[PDB]
């Protein structure tokens, strides 16, 4: 059950201790390298194009609506525990990308295939059993968080606000999905490279616009978040179920910490060493949770700090859009616009995430099947009725989570050695 979350967060605590709080010092260099200009050494696409591919998958409706779901049920204090999910989760994502160095390219051009299902093959053979298990789960799990959750949320959210959108929104999402992922990951890095920054800057500015117009409410909005999350007034640590569980559960969903489905893209990077790309991948959490998610959470609390009528019982994506429309002139149109690119980005990314993990099982023979399936399920997901899809999504993600976490625990000795190699190169 939910014990996996204590396991997932536990690795974050563990690796941070074993890696000695690496994330705080390496972050600026990693950030500069991630967006640095000019490198071609055995890879499918750039370091930057790898990050934007991963961020495309990492940024999704969980950033828009998944936070709202946590804000309502877990209270505003869930944001702080979403932060804890990312900060300690940085160490997890780094270990994921480092161990992605034990990757072998596949036939049918370089394409390259790296991921936790491969680590386990290079573990201490049982690993062959864990890796094929990981691929079995992830091949399915991509349809949940990566396809159906994102494609349904936009379809319905567009129907509420613009309403001339039955399946039409599903059709356009499928066509634009096939066009990009037709040209494999090389096409993705092109599309995800242009889309993601335009997407993130569009949003983030509107949030900083909202913060600008309501400067005074900023620090109290932080206050209610910190006052909550540590509000033991009710129950002996019974906020575990209220704020902490929803913060962690929805936090892992947005930034994708201990899931083992984040490096799938880092492997395609043109990287000299694991540490070169693994530092760029560690920024996956930071941009999602501490930046994008925090922007969403700040508006939500600010709406709650204000009065505003009728938003008290709003489901999720509609709440945030209403929270934006309340504070900004066209904030409602902004959020629903962002939701389209936020979800579409995540469709393309997790397609590759599922492709390479699928091909582990069947080889490149069925790669054509996975893509056409992903396109069709994207269409069906917008039309079908998936009210509790998030619930079945989180279960698949947890199923994916169990094996990879075991590897990161066991292979901590490998990375800490491999880290002491790269940081030695970092003095030259």
């Amino acid at each position, epitope marked *: 059950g939910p014990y996996m979350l204590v396991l997932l967060l536990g690795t974050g605590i563990f690796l941070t201790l074993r890696l000695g709080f690496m994330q705080i010092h390496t972050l600026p260099y990693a950030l500069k390298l991630a967006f640095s200009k000019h490198e071609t050494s055995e890879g499918d696409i750039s370091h930057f194009q790898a990050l934007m591919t991963a961020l495309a998958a990492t940024i999704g409706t969980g950033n828009i609506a998944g936070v709202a779901t946590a804000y309502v049920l877990g209270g505003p204090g869930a944001i702080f525990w979403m932060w804890v999910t990312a900060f300690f989760g940085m160490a997890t994502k780094y270990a994921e990308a480092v161990l992605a160095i034990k990757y072998r390219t596949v036939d049918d051009n370089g394409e390259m295939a790296g991921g936790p299902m491969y680590f386990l093959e290079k573990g201490l053979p049982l690993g062959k059993i864990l890796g094929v298990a990981f691929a079995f789960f992830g091949a399915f799990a991509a349809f949940g968080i990566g396809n159906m959750v994102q494609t*349904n949320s936009v379809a319905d959210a567009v129907a509420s606000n613009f*309403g001339v959108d039955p399946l039409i929104t599903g059709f356009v999402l499928a066509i634009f999905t096939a066009a990009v992922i037709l040209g494999g990951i090389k096409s993705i890095g092109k599309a995800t490279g242009i889309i993601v920054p335009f997407m993130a800057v569009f949003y983030i500015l509107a949030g900083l616009v909202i913060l600008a117009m309501n400067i005074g409410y900023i620090i109290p909005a932080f206050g209610t978040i910190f006052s909550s999350a540590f509000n033991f007034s*009710a*129950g002996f640590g*019974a906020l575990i*179920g209220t704020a902490i569980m929803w913060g962690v559960k929805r936090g892992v969903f947005s930034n994708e910490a201990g899931l083992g489905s984040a490096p799938i893209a880092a492997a395609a990077a043109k990287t000299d060493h694991p540490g070169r790309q693994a530092l760029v991948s560690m920024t996956g959490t930071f941009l999602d949770t501490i930046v994008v998610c925090t922007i969403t959470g700040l508006v939500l609390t600010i709406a709650g700090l204000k009065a505003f009528p009728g938003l008290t*019982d709003l*489901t999720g994506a*509609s709440l945030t859009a209403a929270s934006f429309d309340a504070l900004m002139p066209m904030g409602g149109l902004i959020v629903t616009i962002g939701l389209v690119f936020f979800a579409y980005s995540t469709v393309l990314g997790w397609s590759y995430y599922g492709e390479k993990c699928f091909e582990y099982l069947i080889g490149t023979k069925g790669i054509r099947l996975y893509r056409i399936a992903f396109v069709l399920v994207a269409f069906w997901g917008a039309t*079908a009725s998936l009210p509790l899809v998030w619930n079945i999504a989180d279960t698949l993600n947890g199923a994916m989570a169990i094996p990879n976490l075991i590897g990161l625990l066991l292979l901590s000795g490998v990375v800490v050695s491999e880290t002491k190699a790269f940081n030695e190169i970092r003095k030259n």
Partner: antibody
Amino acid sequence: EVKLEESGGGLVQPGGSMKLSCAASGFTSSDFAMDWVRQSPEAGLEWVAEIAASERHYAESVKGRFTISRDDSKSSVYLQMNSLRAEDSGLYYCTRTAGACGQWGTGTTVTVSS
Amino acid sequence: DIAMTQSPASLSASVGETVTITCRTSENIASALAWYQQKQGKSPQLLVMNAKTLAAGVPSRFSGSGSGTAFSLKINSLQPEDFGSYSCQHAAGWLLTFGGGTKLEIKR
């Protein structure tokens, strides 16, 4: 303030069908997800159907015999019942959902008997 | 299915006293429990949301507490206007279930 007026109740024989309606006002029907809650003549209070603007969920007791629908253009929610049973007798209430049922409706009455 | 059993099924309170009503559930449901008050010829009236949080416009005498496997609705200084049925509801999932009800009557 907010308005929810149910309508369409009546007397219908077993196996028959009818559709209920809930004209809504005072807010934005499109943004909020809606529910149908029914109370039997013995104060049962049983949940019936859910909808948001696209997808729907049903209680197992009525799955396949009820169809919840929505028309945000006309700001009204519907509940279509077919193959009705005696147990479907109750006051059918309209409401909007999320975690708690805050704004409820007037109620409309269904009697299923031969 | 989550089964919520309320006790006492019915009670009579001498006016001006304090009373406590219980809603007990089959499985842990965190803080997702809500309370209603219903009168003759009326829909349920929300009294307390999310176990303890307070709905606006409901008098301060009403207070609810608990989490998980113990919930209580507490009324301080009853009044004749509190005559009715009190129902509890949970928000675990989307098939929200209700309690059997508790009938509040007045002593004379």
